[model samples]
Target: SMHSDLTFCEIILMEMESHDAAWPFLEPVNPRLVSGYRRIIKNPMDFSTMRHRLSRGGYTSSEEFAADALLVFDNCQTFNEDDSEVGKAGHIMRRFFESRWEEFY
Candidate 1:
């Protein structure tokens, strides 16, 4: 059941990326475009990279997988305004994950 639970993480991630809110999180932040993005964000994450890590067996525990997922939202909130597009999406996406997380936990 361990691996099965791992698959739950993968499935939810897919659902997240498919949602419209996933646009900002689908790829890494463009440092050249966004001012000080590189300076502020040390650990960059995105759906593609997470999928790459997952395929390579990077995350062993469900908790590990969940952290990275939440990390994206946390970073989003830090960088974006609550009234901003990304900020709103992060809240929605985080809540979206939180609801499903109860299912896995």
Candidate 2:
């Protein structure tokens, strides 16, 4: 499964794992993924740049991957605005993922 049934803290950990696993295999396959990560972290406003680099670098697919064009929920998005119980985990998750945004943009 793309995601597991865990709290936001667990989810952040999973994302970190994915990020780490991608690193060792990254250099051998696509250098742009690495550059894109670096560039995006430096300036996250460049969505176009990031996606373009990702597509050209062959790390991800194109033609249907843009969020406006296509987005696969895969049963994610369980956090509700009013769910205070989930907030604690969500805050931690946000911080974890936010840190990665620049590290692996």
Candidate 3:
């Protein structure tokens, strides 16, 4: 079991919709990232597990979770073909944080 402040299905739906709206911007930069994003967006159970993990990790607010989530790949040292492109992935990540900074905080 996990603890979370997000108690309503509508809240989850809204979050998914927001992610979907932002996903297009990531597609050309890193298709792999977008692929993973799609998995969570299309699957409610996967998204629930993601939220649960965030909650378990003490990310009690949507903004906290979203900020960390968006930058996860950047924090990783592993490099793939898609991520090898100079500044491509980083640019998208920056924009993501910038656009939603106020929403989460």
Please list the residue runs of candidate 3 whose C-alpha ends up more than 4 Å from where it truly belongs after superposition. 1-49, 55-58, 62-67, 70-73, 76-83, 103-105
> Candidate 2: lDDT over CA atoms?
0.32
Top-TM-score structure, candidate number: 1
lDDT (tens digit, per residue) of candidate 3 on 1-105: 334454432244335536633333322334554445433333222234444555465555556555444544443222224445433544554454555555544
- Candidate lDDT scores, in order, read 0.84, 0.32, 0.43
Pairs of colliding residues, candidate 1: none
* TM-score per candidate, chains pooled: 0.89, 0.26, 0.33
Tens-digit lDDT track of model 1 for 6-46:
78888888888898888899989876667887687778788
Better of 1 and 3 by TM-score: 1
Report the C-alpha displacement of residue 1, candidate 2, in angstroms: 14
Tell me which of candidates 1 and 2 scores higher on TM-score.
Answer: 1
Predicted candidate 2 versus true structure: per-residue lDDT over 3-96, tens digit per residue: 2221332333346435432222212223453344333232221223333344354223323232211111110122223244333433443454
| Highest-scoring model, lDDT | 1
